[PDB]
Design a protein around this nucleic acid. Sequence first.
RNA 1: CAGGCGGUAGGGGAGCGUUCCCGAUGCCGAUGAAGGCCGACCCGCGAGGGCGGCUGGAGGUAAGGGAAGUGCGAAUGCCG
RNA 2: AGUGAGGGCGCGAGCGAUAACGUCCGCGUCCGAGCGCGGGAACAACCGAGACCGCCAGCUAAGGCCCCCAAGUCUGGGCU
RNA 3: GUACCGUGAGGGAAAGGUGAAAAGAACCCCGGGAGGGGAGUGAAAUAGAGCCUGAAACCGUGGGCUUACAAGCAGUCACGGCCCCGCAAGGGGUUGUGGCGUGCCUAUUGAAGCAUGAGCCGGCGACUCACGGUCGUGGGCGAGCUUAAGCCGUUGAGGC
Lengths: 140, 101, 112, 117, 59, 150
Amino acid sequence: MKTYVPKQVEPRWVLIDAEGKTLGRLATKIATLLRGKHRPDWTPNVAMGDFVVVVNADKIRVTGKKLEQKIYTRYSGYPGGLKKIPLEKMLATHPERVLEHAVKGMLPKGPLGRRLFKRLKVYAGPDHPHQAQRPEKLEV
Amino acid sequence: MFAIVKTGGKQYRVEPGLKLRVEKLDAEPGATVELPVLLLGGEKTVVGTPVVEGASVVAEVLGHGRGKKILVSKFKAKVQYRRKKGHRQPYTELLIKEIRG
Amino acid sequence: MEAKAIARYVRISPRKVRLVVDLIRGKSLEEARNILRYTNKRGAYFVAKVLESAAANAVNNHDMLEDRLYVKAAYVDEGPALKRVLPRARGRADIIKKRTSHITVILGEKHG
Amino acid sequence: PRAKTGVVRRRKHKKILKLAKGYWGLRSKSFRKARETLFAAGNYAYAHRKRRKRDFRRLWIVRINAACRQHGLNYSTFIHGLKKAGIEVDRKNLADLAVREPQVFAELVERAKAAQG
Amino acid sequence: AKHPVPKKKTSKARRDARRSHHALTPPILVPCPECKAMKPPHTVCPECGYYAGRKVLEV
Amino acid sequence: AYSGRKIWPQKHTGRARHGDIGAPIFVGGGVVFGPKPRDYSYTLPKKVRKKGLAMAVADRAREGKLLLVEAFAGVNGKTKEFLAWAKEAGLDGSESVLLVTGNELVRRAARNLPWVVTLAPEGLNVYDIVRTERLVMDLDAWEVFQNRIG
RNA sequence: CAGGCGGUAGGGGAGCGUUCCCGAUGCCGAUGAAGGCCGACCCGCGAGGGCGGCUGGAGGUAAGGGAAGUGCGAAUGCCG
RNA sequence: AGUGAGGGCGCGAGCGAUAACGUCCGCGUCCGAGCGCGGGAACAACCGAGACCGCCAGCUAAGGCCCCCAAGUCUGGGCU
RNA sequence: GUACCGUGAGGGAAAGGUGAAAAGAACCCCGGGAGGGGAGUGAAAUAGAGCCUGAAACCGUGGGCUUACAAGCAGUCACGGCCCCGCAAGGGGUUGUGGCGUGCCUAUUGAAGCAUGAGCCGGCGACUCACGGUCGUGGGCGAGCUUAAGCCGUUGAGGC
Ligand SMILES: [Mg+2]
Ligand SMILES: [Mg+2]
Ligand SMILES: [Mg+2]
Ligand SMILES: [Mg+2]
Ligand SMILES: [Mg+2]
Ligand SMILES: [Mg+2]
Ligand SMILES: [Mg+2]
Ligand SMILES: [Mg+2]
Ligand SMILES: [Mg+2]
Ligand SMILES: [Mg+2]
Ligand SMILES: [Mg+2]
Ligand SMILES: [Mg+2]
Ligand SMILES: [Mg+2]
Ligand SMILES: [Mg+2]
Ligand SMILES: [Mg+2]
Ligand SMILES: [Mg+2]
Ligand SMILES: [Mg+2]
Ligand SMILES: [Mg+2]
Ligand SMILES: [Mg+2]
Ligand SMILES: [Mg+2]
Ligand SMILES: [Mg+2]
Ligand SMILES: [Mg+2]
Ligand SMILES: [Mg+2]
Ligand SMILES: [Mg+2]
Ligand SMILES: [Mg+2]
Ligand SMILES: [Mg+2]
Ligand SMILES: [Mg+2]
Ligand SMILES: [Mg+2]
Ligand SMILES: [Mg+2]
Ligand SMILES: [Mg+2]
Ligand SMILES: [Mg+2]
Ligand SMILES: [Mg+2]
Ligand SMILES: [Mg+2]
Ligand SMILES: [Mg+2]
Ligand SMILES: [Mg+2]
Ligand SMILES: [Mg+2]
Ligand SMILES: [Mg+2]
Ligand SMILES: [Mg+2]
Ligand SMILES: [Mg+2]
Ligand SMILES: [Mg+2]
Ligand SMILES: [Mg+2]
Ligand SMILES: [Mg+2]
Ligand SMILES: [Mg+2]
Ligand SMILES: [Mg+2]
Ligand SMILES: [Mg+2]
Ligand SMILES: [Mg+2]
Ligand SMILES: [Mg+2]
Ligand SMILES: [Mg+2]
Ligand SMILES: [Mg+2]
Ligand SMILES: [Mg+2]
Ligand SMILES: [Mg+2]
Ligand SMILES: [Mg+2]
Ligand SMILES: [Mg+2]
Ligand SMILES: [Mg+2]
Ligand SMILES: [Mg+2]
Ligand SMILES: [Mg+2]
Ligand SMILES: [Mg+2]
Ligand SMILES: [Mg+2]
Ligand SMILES: [Mg+2]
Ligand SMILES: [Mg+2]
Ligand SMILES: [Mg+2]
Ligand SMILES: [Mg+2]
Ligand SMILES: [Mg+2]
Ligand SMILES: [Mg+2]
Ligand SMILES: [Mg+2]
Ligand SMILES: [Mg+2]
Ligand SMILES: [Mg+2]
Ligand SMILES: [Mg+2]
Ligand SMILES: [Mg+2]
Ligand SMILES: [Mg+2]
Ligand SMILES: [Mg+2]
Ligand SMILES: [Mg+2]
Ligand SMILES: [Mg+2]
Ligand SMILES: [Mg+2]
Ligand SMILES: [Mg+2]
Ligand SMILES: [Mg+2]
Ligand SMILES: [Mg+2]
Ligand SMILES: [Mg+2]
Ligand SMILES: [Mg+2]
Ligand SMILES: [Mg+2]
Ligand SMILES: [Mg+2]
Ligand SMILES: [Mg+2]
Ligand SMILES: [Mg+2]
Ligand SMILES: [Mg+2]
Ligand SMILES: [Mg+2]
Ligand SMILES: [Mg+2]
Ligand SMILES: [Mg+2]
Ligand SMILES: [Mg+2]
Ligand SMILES: [Mg+2]
Ligand SMILES: [Mg+2]
Ligand SMILES: [Mg+2]
Ligand SMILES: [Mg+2]
Ligand SMILES: [Mg+2]
Ligand SMILES: [Mg+2]
Ligand SMILES: [Mg+2]
Ligand SMILES: [Mg+2]
Ligand SMILES: [Mg+2]
Ligand SMILES: [Mg+2]
Ligand SMILES: [Mg+2]
Ligand SMILES: [Mg+2]
Ligand SMILES: [Mg+2]
Ligand SMILES: [Mg+2]
Ligand SMILES: [Mg+2]
Ligand SMILES: [Mg+2]
Ligand SMILES: [Mg+2]
Ligand SMILES: [Mg+2]
Ligand SMILES: [Mg+2]
Ligand SMILES: [Mg+2]
Ligand SMILES: [Mg+2]
Ligand SMILES: [Mg+2]
Ligand SMILES: [Mg+2]
Ligand SMILES: [Mg+2]
Ligand SMILES: [Mg+2]
Ligand SMILES: [Mg+2]
Ligand SMILES: [Mg+2]
Ligand SMILES: [Mg+2]
Ligand SMILES: [Mg+2]
Ligand SMILES: [Mg+2]
Ligand SMILES: [Mg+2]
Ligand SMILES: [Mg+2]
Ligand SMILES: [Mg+2]
Ligand SMILES: [Mg+2]
Ligand SMILES: [Mg+2]
Ligand SMILES: [Mg+2]
Ligand SMILES: [Mg+2]
Ligand SMILES: [Mg+2]
Ligand SMILES: [Mg+2]
Ligand SMILES: [Mg+2]
Ligand SMILES: [Mg+2]
Ligand SMILES: [Mg+2]
Ligand SMILES: [Mg+2]
Ligand SMILES: [Mg+2]
Ligand SMILES: [Mg+2]
Ligand SMILES: [Mg+2]
Ligand SMILES: [Mg+2]
Ligand SMILES: [Mg+2]
Ligand SMILES: [Mg+2]
Ligand SMILES: [Mg+2]
Ligand SMILES: [Mg+2]
Ligand SMILES: [Mg+2]
Ligand SMILES: [Mg+2]
Ligand SMILES: [Mg+2]
Ligand SMILES: [Mg+2]
Ligand SMILES: [Mg+2]
Ligand SMILES: [Mg+2]
Ligand SMILES: [Mg+2]
Ligand SMILES: [Mg+2]
Ligand SMILES: [Mg+2]
Ligand SMILES: [Mg+2]
Ligand SMILES: [Mg+2]
Ligand SMILES: [Mg+2]
Ligand SMILES: [Mg+2]
Ligand SMILES: [Mg+2]
Ligand SMILES: [Mg+2]
Ligand SMILES: [Mg+2]
Ligand SMILES: [Mg+2]
Ligand SMILES: [Mg+2]
Ligand SMILES: [Mg+2]
Ligand SMILES: [Mg+2]
Ligand SMILES: [Mg+2]
Ligand SMILES: [Mg+2]
Ligand SMILES: [Mg+2]
Ligand SMILES: [Mg+2]
Ligand SMILES: [Mg+2]
Ligand SMILES: [Mg+2]
Ligand SMILES: [Mg+2]
Ligand SMILES: [Mg+2]
Ligand SMILES: [Mg+2]
Ligand SMILES: [Mg+2]
Ligand SMILES: [Mg+2]
Ligand SMILES: [Mg+2]
Ligand SMILES: [Mg+2]
Ligand SMILES: [Mg+2]
Ligand SMILES: [Mg+2]
Ligand SMILES: [Zn+2]
């Protein structure tokens, strides 16, 4: 008696509103969905997660002085090439990234994890363009 | 109707007519043996605590046999240590006849 | 039906001939003649001789018609190498391999 | 009497290259690289047979959990309720039920709930 | 100079990989307007000796 | 047969270190522990030798395959003559025979049979008796055997 | 039935295979020896041993014993 | 027979500078030979635990239960 | 005892195998030749002289699976896909994604080690033998056991 393995299956689009939610505690869940681990037929070597659409990302919330004090870095390969950006500034420019970035670092590394990351759809402001898939508004 | 049975220290979901390979039993081939039922599903739903009282699954032993050879090898480095063992796990094949209960 | 030809113990290095042979493989006997006619390599000579020897064998030996011939298969195999001593500075000596080839051409008919 | 090597060493060598079919480059063409690779392979099998067991328990657990939270309770307490109610159905089967027999899993949920408070 | 030297034999994969570009190009050719024999363009025909209508050299 | 020269200097060649090319490590070099002439013989206790010789005739006695004859009648020398006689002693040659006798002529007759092994009495030995199905002996030779042992 | 069974140096035990000897004036062999190449088959814990297909073309060596130039992956080993 | 280069850690001393992945002894332990398994990101010797083989069964240890990553975004009560 | 090396004394190789029989391939064809394609000989030419068998490294041609947003001691466990063998169920090949993953040897307190050895394959390659010891062991005889050289016999015979 072998374990059930699901056959290729229709995805499930979903909608999240990020206004007011705590950055970390939200993405911890967006990852959970993306990965698929809420479906009882879950399967680790295939992409069977949800598609997540997130809106009002620009209005995510953080505790503490993280607005000014938390610092997003990235290298550049050149000498002196380390760039360091305070959260304030990132929200000011590309607020989408803040959530994007937070969720990414919670997804598996490698081919599949990079594919699951593409199923995340983050927008600042209340409007998203995926009216076509009619995403089921999620609550938690 | 389906049954969750328990034999050879493991559990399997059976239906009548299921060909099942299991840990080696004593029955002569062609003998029929009763297997304890842990749960009955399908139309009824009877749930064992741990075992369902009246139930039983009648199965017939088709035959015994050795599984394919699993070659078990050991190797520690810089220490001249190698071992080759050839494991062929024994089993019993059952045809599931019916589900009493 | 197919017709074969093999020039062998040809004193040229295989990688070099094999370069030319790849030009004509799968080609028609007419492109092949044209291609080798103007391939700026030394190997062109030898592959050409085999390609012509095959075509002869095709019609003179195997009842096949010249207007339908094509290079169905062709290859070069390494032959025994002529080994040679090359004296280097400070007394050292090297071995030069003057390599050789076994050039094979296989022609078929096809009527498309 | 002289007992020259003869046929023996080839036969050993061929025996092992036979095993190493599929291996990459010299690991399938060189006896000495074949052997080395095989050493590893043997140990990976032995250790992975052990791991395979853990791996499936994890998989099953992840599913039983998912199925659980549909009925609004975690695997944590589900298992517990299933224990205090003397159920002995294992995870390999719990998980197959969670998928193939929703209505039965759903029942086992109510039972577990019942027998912990 | 201190005599640089290959640290490892090149693998068959990596050798042949390098030669992915070594492949030869078929001679580019055109038919002669006169004798219709194939020949390289912009060159005087070796078969009939004509170029640009005129007979250039005698074959 | 090689020289004793060190084929090349100990250091700074980049080759491995060597001595003469008669070193067993070279092809064509000497052999490490190859065979040299030998005496495989040894002096088995005389008492043992006798005791087994008697014991061999015993094994053949118990089997019944021992036969004593006082003389072979027809045999004047030729093989067919023995074949005649052998027929009568019931030696049809379906089984091997050790023929022990002092009689020069009789051994001559039986000799070329591929089922017969000829022997003088002095030559009795336990190998030859074991590797034959049947024992057949002169009374004149039995005397020798009885005398050896004792 | 009960218990034990990680293991370097090292000690002990039981086996596998190579060449040769007896077994042999035998038995197997052109209806194909040895050797080679395959195999998802059989037996063996394993070293191995069989069976089948292809090659090969003249040898082979049983049960039971005997004897050793008896098993290689490394020696900047030797030869090719 | 092998061993007669040991090492780390805890504890007790000498040397040292109440330095050293220091050194020298003593008691114990483990690595050595358990660079096999779980934890401690990674890590001989710290925590857990002494691997005969098989299983798509179960319980626990250390350590853990928000995501990467198995299990509580558990329940009270404080502090920052 | 040559080739070759060395002024010299001296050093010192490699190299055996068509087939029972040369019947050793006339003649035609391509080619300057070499070499091949027909033909012919033979049981066999996948015995064609660079000749019995013809392993491995190594080099090609053809086919199946696979690969151009994934970072790797090259494997392994699982699932899935394609191709193939299979009445069935089962299997072979390949590998997309997921899990796990510090070559072998030696020397070492300790090595994946940026310590040693190995380009790869094939073959040669190291605990022997004699005499004497000391234990164990299979036997023979036992207050006794046992012969050495040699002599006789044999010519794989033993006796004295
Ligand atoms: Mg879905
Ligand atoms: Mg839905
Ligand atoms: Mg708003
Ligand atoms: Mg700058
Ligand atoms: Mg800087
Ligand atoms: Mg900025
Ligand atoms: Mg990671
Ligand atoms: Mg995106
Ligand atoms: Mg908007
Ligand atoms: Mg909108
Ligand atoms: Mg928009
Ligand atoms: Mg939708
Ligand atoms: Mg049903
Ligand atoms: Mg079955
Ligand atoms: Mg009954
Ligand atoms: Mg089987
Ligand atoms: Mg099997
Ligand atoms: Mg170890
Ligand atoms: Mg074993
Ligand atoms: Mg090509
Ligand atoms: Mg043309
Ligand atoms: Mg120069
Ligand atoms: Mg050189
Ligand atoms: Mg070179
Ligand atoms: Mg050897
Ligand atoms: Mg492979
Ligand atoms: Mg295991
Ligand atoms: Mg694990
Ligand atoms: Mg377990
Ligand atoms: Mg409770
Ligand atoms: Mg290639
Ligand atoms: Mg180019
Ligand atoms: Mg024109
Ligand atoms: Mg032209
Ligand atoms: Mg000499
Ligand atoms: Mg000297
Ligand atoms: Mg030399
Ligand atoms: Mg030297
Ligand atoms: Mg050098
Ligand atoms: Mg050097
Ligand atoms: Mg050297
Ligand atoms: Mg030497
Ligand atoms: Mg030599
Ligand atoms: Mg010796
Ligand atoms: Mg001697
Ligand atoms: Mg003595
Ligand atoms: Mg004597
Ligand atoms: Mg006489
Ligand atoms: Mg005779
Ligand atoms: Mg005889
Ligand atoms: Mg005689
Ligand atoms: Mg005789
Ligand atoms: Mg005799
Ligand atoms: Mg054994
Ligand atoms: Mg014989
Ligand atoms: Mg014979
Ligand atoms: Mg004879
Ligand atoms: Mg026989
Ligand atoms: Mg014949
Ligand atoms: Mg036959
Ligand atoms: Mg045959
Ligand atoms: Mg092959
Ligand atoms: Mg088979
Ligand atoms: Mg078996
Ligand atoms: Mg045998
Ligand atoms: Mg067998
Ligand atoms: Mg044949
Ligand atoms: Mg054969
Ligand atoms: Mg012959
Ligand atoms: Mg034998
Ligand atoms: Mg036989
Ligand atoms: Mg035997
Ligand atoms: Mg034998
Ligand atoms: Mg014997
Ligand atoms: Mg034997
Ligand atoms: Mg030897
Ligand atoms: Mg070695
Ligand atoms: Mg070597
Ligand atoms: Mg070297
Ligand atoms: Mg050499
Ligand atoms: Mg060399
Ligand atoms: Mg050689
Ligand atoms: Mg060499
Ligand atoms: Mg000592
Ligand atoms: Mg001592
Ligand atoms: Mg000392
Ligand atoms: Mg030391
Ligand atoms: Mg110590
Ligand atoms: Mg200590
Ligand atoms: Mg410490
Ligand atoms: Mg301390
Ligand atoms: Mg102090
Ligand atoms: Mg101090
Ligand atoms: Mg201090
Ligand atoms: Mg300090
Ligand atoms: Mg201080
Ligand atoms: Mg200290
Ligand atoms: Mg101190
Ligand atoms: Mg201590
Ligand atoms: Mg450990
Ligand atoms: Mg220990
Ligand atoms: Mg280690
Ligand atoms: Mg550990
Ligand atoms: Mg760890
Ligand atoms: Mg740490
Ligand atoms: Mg370490
Ligand atoms: Mg440490
Ligand atoms: Mg570790
Ligand atoms: Mg360790
Ligand atoms: Mg701990
Ligand atoms: Mg503790
Ligand atoms: Mg317990
Ligand atoms: Mg537990
Ligand atoms: Mg504790
Ligand atoms: Mg705990
Ligand atoms: Mg955590
Ligand atoms: Mg984990
Ligand atoms: Mg989890
Ligand atoms: Mg010389
Ligand atoms: Mg001859
Ligand atoms: Mg001859
Ligand atoms: Mg010819
Ligand atoms: Mg001509
Ligand atoms: Mg000329
Ligand atoms: Mg012919
Ligand atoms: Mg013919
Ligand atoms: Mg024939
Ligand atoms: Mg043939
Ligand atoms: Mg000749
Ligand atoms: Mg000749
Ligand atoms: Mg020749
Ligand atoms: Mg020639
Ligand atoms: Mg040759
Ligand atoms: Mg050949
Ligand atoms: Mg094709
Ligand atoms: Mg290909
Ligand atoms: Mg990507
Ligand atoms: Mg993998
Ligand atoms: Mg899948
Ligand atoms: Mg396809
Ligand atoms: Mg296909
Ligand atoms: Mg197939
Ligand atoms: Mg079939
Ligand atoms: Mg079929
Ligand atoms: Mg299948
Ligand atoms: Mg497959
Ligand atoms: Mg793979
Ligand atoms: Mg597969
Ligand atoms: Mg990985
Ligand atoms: Mg390490
Ligand atoms: Mg080494
Ligand atoms: Mg280390
Ligand atoms: Mg190294
Ligand atoms: Mg270092
Ligand atoms: Mg160094
Ligand atoms: Mg050193
Ligand atoms: Mg070497
Ligand atoms: Mg080497
Ligand atoms: Mg090196
Ligand atoms: Mg080199
Ligand atoms: Mg040896
Ligand atoms: Mg010794
Ligand atoms: Mg010894
Ligand atoms: Mg020895
Ligand atoms: Mg001795
Ligand atoms: Mg003593
Ligand atoms: Mg003794
Ligand atoms: Mg005694
Ligand atoms: Mg003496
Ligand atoms: Mg005489
Ligand atoms: Mg004499
Ligand atoms: Mg003799
Ligand atoms: Mg003789
Ligand atoms: Mg004597
Ligand atoms: Zn023209």
